[PDB]
UniProtKB/Swiss-Prot annotation, chains A, B, C, D:
Gene, per the UniProt record: STING1
Lineage of origin: Eukaryota, Metazoa, Chordata, Craniata, Vertebrata
Keyword RNA-binding belongs to the record: no
Signal peptide positions on this chain: none
Record region (Cyclic dinucleotide-binding domain (CBD)): 125-294
Protein name: Stimulator of interferon genes protein
Keyword Endoplasmic reticulum: yes
PANTHER family: STIMULATOR OF INTERFERON GENES PROTEIN
Amino acid sequence: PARLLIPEPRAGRARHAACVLLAVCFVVLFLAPIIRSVCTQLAALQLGVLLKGCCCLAEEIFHLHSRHHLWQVLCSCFPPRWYLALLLVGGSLTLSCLCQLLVLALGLQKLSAVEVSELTESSKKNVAHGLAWSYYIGYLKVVLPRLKECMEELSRTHRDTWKLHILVPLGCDIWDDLEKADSNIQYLADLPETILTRAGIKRRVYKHSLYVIRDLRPCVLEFASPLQTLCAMSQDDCAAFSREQRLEQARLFYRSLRDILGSSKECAGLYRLIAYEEPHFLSGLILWHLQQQQ
Amino acid sequence: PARLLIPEPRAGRARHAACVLLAVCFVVLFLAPIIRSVCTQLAALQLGVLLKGCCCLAEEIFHLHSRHHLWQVLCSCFPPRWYLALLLVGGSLTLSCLCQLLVLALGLQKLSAVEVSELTESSKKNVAHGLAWSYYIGYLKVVLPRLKECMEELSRTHRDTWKLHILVPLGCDIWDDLEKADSNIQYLADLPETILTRAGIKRRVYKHSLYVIRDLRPCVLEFASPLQTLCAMSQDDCAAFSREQRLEQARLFYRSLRDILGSSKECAGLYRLIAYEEPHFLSGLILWHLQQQQ
Amino acid sequence: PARLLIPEPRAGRARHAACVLLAVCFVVLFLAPIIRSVCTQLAALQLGVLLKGCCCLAEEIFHLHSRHHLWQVLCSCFPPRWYLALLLVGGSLTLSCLCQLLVLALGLQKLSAVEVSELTESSKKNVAHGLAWSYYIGYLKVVLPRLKECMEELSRTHRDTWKLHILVPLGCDIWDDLEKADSNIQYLADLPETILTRAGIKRRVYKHSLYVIRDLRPCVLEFASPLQTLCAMSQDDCAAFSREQRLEQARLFYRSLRDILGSSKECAGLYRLIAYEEPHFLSGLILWHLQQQQ
Amino acid sequence: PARLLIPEPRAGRARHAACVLLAVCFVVLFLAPIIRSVCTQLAALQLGVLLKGCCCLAEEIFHLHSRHHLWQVLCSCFPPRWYLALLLVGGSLTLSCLCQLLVLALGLQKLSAVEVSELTESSKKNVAHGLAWSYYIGYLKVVLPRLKECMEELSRTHRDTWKLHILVPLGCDIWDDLEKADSNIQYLADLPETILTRAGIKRRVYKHSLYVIRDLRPCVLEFASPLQTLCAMSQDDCAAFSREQRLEQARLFYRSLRDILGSSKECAGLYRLIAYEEPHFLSGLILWHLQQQQ
Ligand SMILES: Nc1nc(=O)c2ncn([C@@H]3O[C@@H]4COP(=O)(O)O[C@H]5[C@@H](O)[C@H](n6cnc7c(N)ncnc76)O[C@@H]5COP(=O)(O)O[C@@H]3[C@@H]4O)c2[nH]1
Ligand SMILES: Nc1nc(=O)c2ncn([C@@H]3O[C@@H]4COP(=O)(O)O[C@H]5[C@@H](O)[C@H](n6cnc7c(N)ncnc76)O[C@@H]5COP(=O)(O)O[C@@H]3[C@@H]4O)c2[nH]1
């Protein structure tokens, strides 16, 4: 199997390194008269933060009813601990205000790549987490409990392997015809369908397929579909989206899906996530996962 | 029809208000000796930004190969115009460094609601835009060109109305049985299906339905499905997601879908977005949209 | 008809404004001892220009036979009036040479948008002029004299309208099926073909089509084809090409084609350039051009 | 085969030679008091660049809506790093301004041959690259996948040679009758045609031809057509275009076509670029390329 390097979540040791550098710099400040001097700089920052809120009253007043329907807007305007800044302003000029305005005009407070990356993958509001929730709720929550009955119905036409391997290709190749993927992968038949009236559509139909892979074992197998969506979210270039970020979002999607099916409760063992990169081959990986459980 | 208040995109007039306040404050500074003093504050900011990059070398060194595979990491570490800060540091102490570290330790640089809102909806990497791209590529790109032929095939069993009204309920109510939605809405039949081998599944089936609404007109009609996903992304509470943000994300989804089908090229006039809030009724709105085109 | 804003050629009034500002600044220098001082700056420029030529001997010596097959290279190296610089250098140091080299190293002589725009559209070597020459020589020079005979041959199966309206959509929409463009535009038949042995291909075939547009008039009509090429020169993104520059290049193409058919001598009145932007409609514009000549 | 000398792309070693001459001149300046003197010359340049922008406000104000529809114009007016010039102007007269205006009036900033050559072939907006994109998209993208089927259809009336040799004569001779090119080249038959509704023309027809060359081998063969366009872009003299630049543009065209078919993905091996100069002969070169693959 190929080496799976998916990124871990952020541990948050940067604050620890900042604290250590703070303590070391205080020790070198060792080897009372200057503490007031600290305040002469400190509220100098906390003015400008307030200034940012003042400018954020600018556009938000054009969004009163359409986004916020007064006190809600000013509640949303500045960071929530606003009284510390005024508390520090009271404990004491135009140069500071003009410097903060000269910063805020030219826009030199642009965050870097790693900061927006941690802000993206920290919140659960990016593309990959929402799309993984869509794939979990819309498909996997519904089909997977009805898998064993259709398997038994085809059985009247190996109980360890009655699962649903989801191929998750961390990359670009997504194929509709898996018989073009290898000469070893062969189509045999399909499962009995599933009929559900979902979201106004009456009798929506979910299907499957059964693939026999030999040298001599059957399995159910399909691709994780919405990666295909990402495959058109950068090729068509109508979304601001790059290939390196495409690989990043695919790894994030596999990580989020692994997390969701980790704390899943209905999906007992019926799923089996197979993920890979491009280093024939795919049948060899399928056979390795298939023999691994036995 | 109900009043549709969807939020406009950010115009960006806050920078203009900052510039105006800058010019006015410079005029009051009117009515050369102090400009060097500006630099004594100015690089005082640009040190600390560099300090943030120093702390962002901390956790990123635990993410060398798993996210970035040296120079790529330091390239991603600080904001890209790094030389202006060192240029300003050269033009001239421990108090400034300790103040910036004391800020970065306690974490008082937390962005407000409106800043993270503009950062979210500014980039095309939130939940609603990616999910709208999924609904456009997976379903609307495929089905809609094959609509007229199925309509003509049922016609051999009103050409102005041969469309697909997508009900987009900006709210919480999403129903599977539209006959429970009103006594006026009646199910009649379904369109001939669509069979496509998509993403490894052989013979995936797309269906539709035809609803006759009288007092005396037929139409095709369905719900925008993945809003249902959002309806379970906060009720189950396994995602950090609120109801006010649910209404916000639904309005954002309708806006993004309106934008995508605005610049669409295959979907000629075959879609017709109907969106509403909860103020019987739904049939009255459907009849108003249906009579509006004629 | 929509308002056609195509850009005029460059008149060249910027040199006039420079001359006026020169004369005014000389008048303020009024209200002999300093003229030598002028030379102390003046050759200071004309050294560095020579320096640019010295650095342009660098890469060109790697291109001796492959691009230039000595005296040809140095002839091509610097600007052609080289003796004025040495003439000014003789009339009199290391600071000037080091300043010019410090400029040429960091590359601060990067031209702006308007300068490269005037340099592009000034020379007849851009994309749009060459592609318009291709469309004039390859197609319009050959087909158009043989139009009336094919029209008369279909006439034995309104002489004011026997022309070839070339639709030039200044934009993005280019359609292969003009019957999908409007319900009013209808296909009737095609002209008799044209057979020519061109560029090694024996019996290359040129065709046409005849469209009847009613409410009750026929016309010949086709799209300006190579705009489609521009439609794939930025969407596929394999060329450095933007949409705003796509609209600019399309307007430039229509202007160049209008110029070429202006001074044309074989194409008497048989062409009729119809161009438009996107504000049904297209048939209305076609009927307006069709009724305008009568 | 004749020696193919096509020009390589610009490597960019001239900046390296400038940097080396800078370092050597600094070393001779070795073997603090003068650095301010540098600035007394340095902003003396950066004023005049700003002056160029001032004069470029002159004609552009006559092009407000017709090319740019204020802030867009001034954004396009000067080079984008405008603040460095004012930053250097602040760190300190009429002689400098009058010298820069006296330069800009007489127009002694005319670029040389090699500078406009690198600016032309550097950007992808010259004649040859756009015309090569036209020949790739309009013809080679469409015909070449349908080649093998027509070859097999004539085969039912040597699989290594089923290709399309494009003759690219880097020169002036382009002939319509290849049987006049040599007694050895003989016409036999033509391929089955290709019918496509392209750009409003219904049933546009693409053809081919099959040439048997003996002493005893067949091949498909045609000329690169739009070189013929260049053959009329200087002979008719309606475009500013010379014969030496004609050979240069032809070599540039062959290089760009070689690059495009290098990164091509549909055209597997079906093309085979044959290019030559004029030193019978052409059949000998064709036979050498034909025997080379076997
Ligand atoms: N009304 C309706 N009838 C349909 O048959 C249908 N099929 C898809 N869709 C909607 O279009 C989109 C395309 O599916 P996508 O591939 O992007 O992810 C889909 C897909 O990965 C998976 N899935 C759903 N149905 C099938 C199916 N029949 N076969 C395979 N996978 C399916 O579950 C994901 C989410 O489905 P929904 O989020 O409930 O609505 C889908 C989806 O929004 C449908 N909508
Ligand atoms: N409407 C229409 N019907 C035609 O039959 C036709 N034939 C040519 N053209 C247009 O005129 C011009 C002349 O072709 P050129 O030789 O300069 O390069 C042409 C030519 O090199 C090649 N090509 C296209 N069709 C053929 C063809 N039948 N035979 C050989 N070569 C062809 O592809 C190039 C680009 O074609 P288009 O860029 O899509 O439009 C062409 C072109 O703009 C046509 N336009």
